[PDB]
Amino acid sequence: GSSGSSGMEPHKVVPLSKPHPPVVGKVTHHSIELYWDLEQKEKRQGPQEQWLRFSIEEEDPKMHSYGVIYTGYATRHVVEGLEPRTLYKFRLKVTSPSGEYEYSPVVSVATTRESGPSSG
């Protein structure tokens, strides 16, 4: 789609840059591995309290709505409970230690096909 217009600007204030999309390492037909440790690379300058928050969400094909599947400071995440040969969209959100916050570009990923059980 070609939609994106806004006529509002922050007064004497500048928001933080937009976060990058999370990468997909391990791909299972029952789950999906995710790791966005490519943004908060910079040393952990200061105490843990001086860290940024990372909230992950997912869109619903039936509810056409998003839902925070994960919320924390971790850089990795694995969407549990998935189906084989199924696509899933996830958005990475971040909020500066001051208040500002941005959103990452939706990342659609399709799991793998059912191979077999684990215990054998």
Reference 112, options 26, 25, 27; nearest CA is 27
Domain ranges of the chain: 18-112
Q: Give the Cα separation of 61 and 74 in Å (integer).
A: 27
Which residues does residue 32 pair with via DSSP β-bridges, in sequence order?
27, 79
Query: What was the structure determination method?
Result: NMR
- Three-state SS string over the chain comes to CCCCCCCCCCCCCCCCCCCCCCECCCEECCEEEEECCCCCCCCCCCCHHHCCEEEEEEECCCCCCEEEEEEECCCEEEEECCCCCCEEEEEEEEECCCCCEEECCCEEEECCCCCCCCCC
The CATH architecture of the domain made up of 18-112 is Sandwich (2.60)
